[PDB]
PDB file of C-alpha atoms in Angstrom:
ATOM      1  CA  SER A   1      86.769-128.675 -25.793  1.00  0.00           C
ATOM      2  CA  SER A   2      86.128-124.990 -24.645  1.00  0.00           C
ATOM      3  CA  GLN A   3      82.670-125.012 -26.222  1.00  0.00           C
ATOM      4  CA  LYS A   4      81.974-128.042 -23.252  1.00  0.00           C
ATOM      5  CA  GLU A   5      82.206-126.823 -19.573  1.00  0.00           C
ATOM      6  CA  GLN A   6      80.717-129.616 -17.809  1.00  0.00           C
ATOM      7  CA  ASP A   7      82.664-132.386 -19.682  1.00  0.00           C
ATOM      8  CA  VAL A   8      85.599-130.392 -20.226  1.00  0.00           C
ATOM      9  CA  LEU A   9      86.293-130.879 -16.345  1.00  0.00           C
ATOM     10  CA  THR A  10      88.738-133.181 -15.004  1.00  0.00           C
ATOM     11  CA  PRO A  11      88.238-137.019 -15.496  1.00  0.00           C
ATOM     12  CA  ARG A  12      86.774-137.309 -11.931  1.00  0.00           C
ATOM     13  CA  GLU A  13      84.977-134.078 -12.039  1.00  0.00           C
ATOM     14  CA  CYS A  14      82.877-135.266 -15.293  1.00  0.00           C
ATOM     15  CA  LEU A  15      82.508-138.446 -13.213  1.00  0.00           C
ATOM     16  CA  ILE A  16      81.197-136.193 -10.512  1.00  0.00           C
ATOM     17  CA  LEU A  17      79.086-134.257 -12.353  1.00  0.00           C
ATOM     18  CA  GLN A  18      77.547-137.282 -14.553  1.00  0.00           C
ATOM     19  CA  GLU A  19      76.724-138.572 -10.846  1.00  0.00           C
ATOM     20  CA  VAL A  20      74.869-135.455  -9.686  1.00  0.00           C
ATOM     21  CA  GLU A  21      73.116-135.095 -12.716  1.00  0.00           C
ATOM     22  CA  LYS A  22      72.416-138.540 -12.311  1.00  0.00           C
ATOM     23  CA  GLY A  23      69.355-137.644 -10.177  1.00  0.00           C
ATOM     24  CA  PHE A  24      70.830-138.701  -6.617  1.00  0.00           C
ATOM     25  CA  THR A  25      73.226-136.290  -4.892  1.00  0.00           C
ATOM     26  CA  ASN A  26      76.837-136.273  -4.050  1.00  0.00           C
ATOM     27  CA  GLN A  27      76.969-138.747  -1.841  1.00  0.00           C
ATOM     28  CA  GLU A  28      75.846-141.234  -4.875  1.00  0.00           C
ATOM     29  CA  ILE A  29      79.131-139.829  -6.774  1.00  0.00           C
ATOM     30  CA  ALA A  30      80.870-140.896  -3.408  1.00  0.00           C
ATOM     31  CA  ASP A  31      79.362-143.936  -3.496  1.00  0.00           C
ATOM     32  CA  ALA A  32      80.197-144.185  -7.239  1.00  0.00           C
ATOM     33  CA  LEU A  33      83.786-143.218  -7.254  1.00  0.00           C
ATOM     34  CA  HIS A  34      84.126-145.038  -4.292  1.00  0.00           C
ATOM     35  CA  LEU A  35      85.259-142.653  -2.332  1.00  0.00           C
ATOM     36  CA  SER A  36      83.219-140.834   0.728  1.00  0.00           C
ATOM     37  CA  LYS A  37      80.675-138.219   1.225  1.00  0.00           C
ATOM     38  CA  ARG A  38      83.324-136.380   2.611  1.00  0.00           C
ATOM     39  CA  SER A  39      86.024-137.266  -0.404  1.00  0.00           C
ATOM     40  CA  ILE A  40      83.236-135.903  -2.998  1.00  0.00           C
ATOM     41  CA  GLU A  41      81.509-133.053  -1.134  1.00  0.00           C
ATOM     42  CA  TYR A  42      85.683-131.720  -1.729  1.00  0.00           C
ATOM     43  CA  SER A  43      84.945-131.877  -5.267  1.00  0.00           C
ATOM     44  CA  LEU A  44      81.610-130.592  -5.468  1.00  0.00           C
ATOM     45  CA  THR A  45      83.015-127.368  -3.621  1.00  0.00           C
ATOM     46  CA  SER A  46      85.640-126.957  -6.132  1.00  0.00           C
ATOM     47  CA  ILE A  47      83.500-127.870  -9.074  1.00  0.00           C
ATOM     48  CA  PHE A  48      81.441-124.553  -7.516  1.00  0.00           C
ATOM     49  CA  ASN A  49      84.672-122.726  -8.828  1.00  0.00           C
ATOM     50  CA  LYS A  50      85.371-124.904 -12.170  1.00  0.00           C
ATOM     51  CA  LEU A  51      81.991-125.332 -13.467  1.00  0.00           C
ATOM     52  CA  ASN A  52      80.827-121.981 -12.109  1.00  0.00           C
ATOM     53  CA  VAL A  53      78.656-124.187 -10.416  1.00  0.00           C
ATOM     54  CA  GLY A  54      76.788-122.642  -7.125  1.00  0.00           C
ATOM     55  CA  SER A  55      78.024-125.928  -4.795  1.00  0.00           C
ATOM     56  CA  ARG A  56      76.432-128.939  -6.125  1.00  0.00           C
ATOM     57  CA  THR A  57      72.767-128.227  -7.294  1.00  0.00           C
ATOM     58  CA  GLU A  58      74.038-126.316 -10.626  1.00  0.00           C
ATOM     59  CA  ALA A  59      76.616-129.216 -11.408  1.00  0.00           C
ATOM     60  CA  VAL A  60      73.193-131.440 -11.514  1.00  0.00           C
ATOM     61  CA  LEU A  61      71.015-128.527 -12.990  1.00  0.00           C
ATOM     62  CA  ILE A  62      73.327-127.132 -15.327  1.00  0.00           C
ATOM     63  CA  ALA A  63      73.798-130.425 -17.353  1.00  0.00           C
ATOM     64  CA  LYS A  64      69.751-130.479 -18.029  1.00  0.00           C
ATOM     65  CA  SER A  65      70.434-127.163 -19.068  1.00  0.00           C
ATOM     66  CA  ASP A  66      72.867-128.144 -21.455  1.00  0.00           C
ATOM     67  CA  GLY A  67      71.295-131.053 -22.648  1.00  0.00           C
ATOM     68  CA  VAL A  68      73.524-133.772 -21.011  1.00  0.00           C
ATOM     69  CA  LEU A  69      70.647-135.175 -19.223  1.00  0.00           C
TER      70      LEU A  69
ATOM     71  CA  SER B   1      47.271-131.722  -7.138  1.00  0.00           C
ATOM     72  CA  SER B   2      48.447-135.156  -7.137  1.00  0.00           C
ATOM     73  CA  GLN B   3      49.355-134.330 -10.661  1.00  0.00           C
ATOM     74  CA  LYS B   4      52.225-132.228  -8.974  1.00  0.00           C
ATOM     75  CA  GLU B   5      55.063-133.192  -6.815  1.00  0.00           C
ATOM     76  CA  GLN B   6      57.378-130.411  -6.904  1.00  0.00           C
ATOM     77  CA  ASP B   7      54.962-127.963  -5.844  1.00  0.00           C
ATOM     78  CA  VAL B   8      52.264-129.811  -4.067  1.00  0.00           C
ATOM     79  CA  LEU B   9      54.994-129.532  -1.738  1.00  0.00           C
ATOM     80  CA  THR B  10      54.542-127.481   1.456  1.00  0.00           C
ATOM     81  CA  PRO B  11      54.542-123.651   1.134  1.00  0.00           C
ATOM     82  CA  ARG B  12      58.462-123.723   2.407  1.00  0.00           C
ATOM     83  CA  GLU B  13      59.412-126.992   0.498  1.00  0.00           C
ATOM     84  CA  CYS B  14      58.145-125.461  -2.740  1.00  0.00           C
ATOM     85  CA  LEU B  15      60.772-122.301  -2.160  1.00  0.00           C
ATOM     86  CA  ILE B  16      62.977-124.792  -1.007  1.00  0.00           C
ATOM     87  CA  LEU B  17      62.584-126.379  -4.548  1.00  0.00           C
ATOM     88  CA  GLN B  18      62.557-122.921  -6.483  1.00  0.00           C
ATOM     89  CA  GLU B  19      65.702-121.377  -4.653  1.00  0.00           C
ATOM     90  CA  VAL B  20      67.612-124.960  -5.398  1.00  0.00           C
ATOM     91  CA  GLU B  21      66.176-125.276  -8.944  1.00  0.00           C
ATOM     92  CA  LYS B  22      67.364-122.068  -9.531  1.00  0.00           C
ATOM     93  CA  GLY B  23      70.852-123.171  -9.993  1.00  0.00           C
ATOM     94  CA  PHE B  24      72.557-121.908  -7.135  1.00  0.00           C
ATOM     95  CA  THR B  25      72.096-124.821  -4.026  1.00  0.00           C
ATOM     96  CA  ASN B  26      70.388-124.987  -0.565  1.00  0.00           C
ATOM     97  CA  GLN B  27      72.616-122.128   0.771  1.00  0.00           C
ATOM     98  CA  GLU B  28      70.915-119.996  -1.434  1.00  0.00           C
ATOM     99  CA  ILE B  29      67.585-121.184  -0.015  1.00  0.00           C
ATOM    100  CA  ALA B  30      68.846-120.394   3.340  1.00  0.00           C
ATOM    101  CA  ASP B  31      70.119-117.070   2.378  1.00  0.00           C
ATOM    102  CA  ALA B  32      66.701-116.922   0.287  1.00  0.00           C
ATOM    103  CA  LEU B  33      64.138-118.253   3.309  1.00  0.00           C
ATOM    104  CA  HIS B  34      66.144-115.775   5.414  1.00  0.00           C
ATOM    105  CA  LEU B  35      66.817-119.421   7.747  1.00  0.00           C
ATOM    106  CA  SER B  36      70.240-120.988   7.621  1.00  0.00           C
ATOM    107  CA  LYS B  37      72.157-123.619   5.625  1.00  0.00           C
ATOM    108  CA  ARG B  38      71.547-125.777   8.709  1.00  0.00           C
ATOM    109  CA  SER B  39      68.213-125.616   8.594  1.00  0.00           C
ATOM    110  CA  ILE B  40      67.328-125.480   4.611  1.00  0.00           C
ATOM    111  CA  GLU B  41      69.434-128.786   5.059  1.00  0.00           C
ATOM    112  CA  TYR B  42      66.892-129.974   7.624  1.00  0.00           C
ATOM    113  CA  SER B  43      64.280-129.485   4.556  1.00  0.00           C
ATOM    114  CA  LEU B  44      66.488-130.655   1.965  1.00  0.00           C
ATOM    115  CA  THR B  45      67.124-134.050   3.630  1.00  0.00           C
ATOM    116  CA  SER B  46      63.581-134.295   4.149  1.00  0.00           C
ATOM    117  CA  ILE B  47      62.385-133.059   0.479  1.00  0.00           C
ATOM    118  CA  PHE B  48      64.688-136.102   0.306  1.00  0.00           C
ATOM    119  CA  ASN B  49      61.695-138.190   1.177  1.00  0.00           C
ATOM    120  CA  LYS B  50      58.849-135.552  -0.168  1.00  0.00           C
ATOM    121  CA  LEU B  51      59.666-135.357  -3.576  1.00  0.00           C
ATOM    122  CA  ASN B  52      61.353-138.597  -4.042  1.00  0.00           C
ATOM    123  CA  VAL B  53      64.773-136.330  -4.158  1.00  0.00           C
ATOM    124  CA  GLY B  54      68.303-138.250  -3.668  1.00  0.00           C
ATOM    125  CA  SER B  55      69.022-135.387  -1.275  1.00  0.00           C
ATOM    126  CA  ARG B  56      69.271-132.212  -2.936  1.00  0.00           C
ATOM    127  CA  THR B  57      70.536-133.003  -6.682  1.00  0.00           C
ATOM    128  CA  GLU B  58      66.833-134.245  -7.635  1.00  0.00           C
ATOM    129  CA  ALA B  59      65.003-131.023  -5.911  1.00  0.00           C
ATOM    130  CA  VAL B  60      67.187-128.754  -8.452  1.00  0.00           C
ATOM    131  CA  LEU B  61      67.437-131.674 -11.293  1.00  0.00           C
ATOM    132  CA  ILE B  62      63.555-132.986 -11.767  1.00  0.00           C
ATOM    133  CA  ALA B  63      62.287-129.536 -11.741  1.00  0.00           C
ATOM    134  CA  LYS B  64      63.799-129.200 -14.915  1.00  0.00           C
ATOM    135  CA  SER B  65      63.051-132.484 -15.870  1.00  0.00           C
ATOM    136  CA  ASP B  66      59.514-131.682 -15.368  1.00  0.00           C
ATOM    137  CA  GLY B  67      59.552-128.272 -16.960  1.00  0.00           C
ATOM    138  CA  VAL B  68      59.431-125.955 -13.756  1.00  0.00           C
ATOM    139  CA  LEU B  69      62.933-124.412 -14.981  1.00  0.00           C
TER     140      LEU B  69
END
């Protein structure tokens, strides 16, 4: 639970991460969740707060750092 | 030379990567190169092509994947 950070996030936020950390971008996340590059960006900017991510770059970076991918 | 992909890039493009792969975002790249979020984004979107990066996410992701950070 509190051990995790990238997966302890909200279900969508976790989906967000996996789609960024995937190795594409927020646009692919939108494409994945069926949202929009506009919609997920609002989740990326908030993941900036939640995951202490810089904006998106850490969302994908920290995942590998942790061992997620 | 041809072995590298992330660092074989243009001097700026390499600087771009290191600032994304750093663990902040393109905005920190802008702030690092003293450009702008609007100018580096133009480099990120082209690094999409150069590095085969998905937009920016791979720029920071693939770095760790390779062992850059």
